């Protein structure tokens, strides 16, 4: 149950920067075992690859597996990913500074994104720190 680089290259066939996107995706899924690459229709408009799953976020002495979806545009890594928190039936989205009504994530890291200094490993690192202070979702009481 693991994705081969070959399968990843096929998923980004229509991408403008393929090797770069594959390279970073491999890095991300290797370090974050709970994120999985999936080719899906973005908003039912067009196919793009995204990293789906959870990232470990420590909050008040406990670690939570926050559900997220990182959409890699066909311009990745030159343009930042479009990121969303994805609440399950047992939780709700906490709208605030870094999360809007739709669960879309907003971070300075994304706003000033610039290749090659900016990357997914850096972005996820930021999310763990930022969400650790302000969770993007909470379990339903």
């Amino acid at each position: 149950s693991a994705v081969s680089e070959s399968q990843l290259k096929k998923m980004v066939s229509k991408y403008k920067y393929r090797d770069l996107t594959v390279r970073e995706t491999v890095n991300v899924i290797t370090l974050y075992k709970d994120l999985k690459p999936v080719l899906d229709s973005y908003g039912g408009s067009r196919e793009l690859m995204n990293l789906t799953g959870t990232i470990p976020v420590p909050y008040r002495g406990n670690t939570y597996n926050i559900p997220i979806c990182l959409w890699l545009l066909d311009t990745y890594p030159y343009n930042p990913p479009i990121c969303f928190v994805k609440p399950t039936s047992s939780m709700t989205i906490k709208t605030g500074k870094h999360v809007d009504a739709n669960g879309k994530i907003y971070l300075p890291y994304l706003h000033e994104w610039k290749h090659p200094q900016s990357d997914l490993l850096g972005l996820i690192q930021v999310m763990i720190v930022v969400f650790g202070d302000e969770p993007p979702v909470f379990s339903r009481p």
């Binding site: 959870t54 597996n65 709700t92 909470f138 339903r140 009481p141």
Partner: peptide
């Protein structure tokens, strides 16, 4: 890992 979130505060 199974999606988890902190209790509402």
């Amino acid at each position: 890992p199974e999606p988890t979130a902190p209790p509402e505060e």
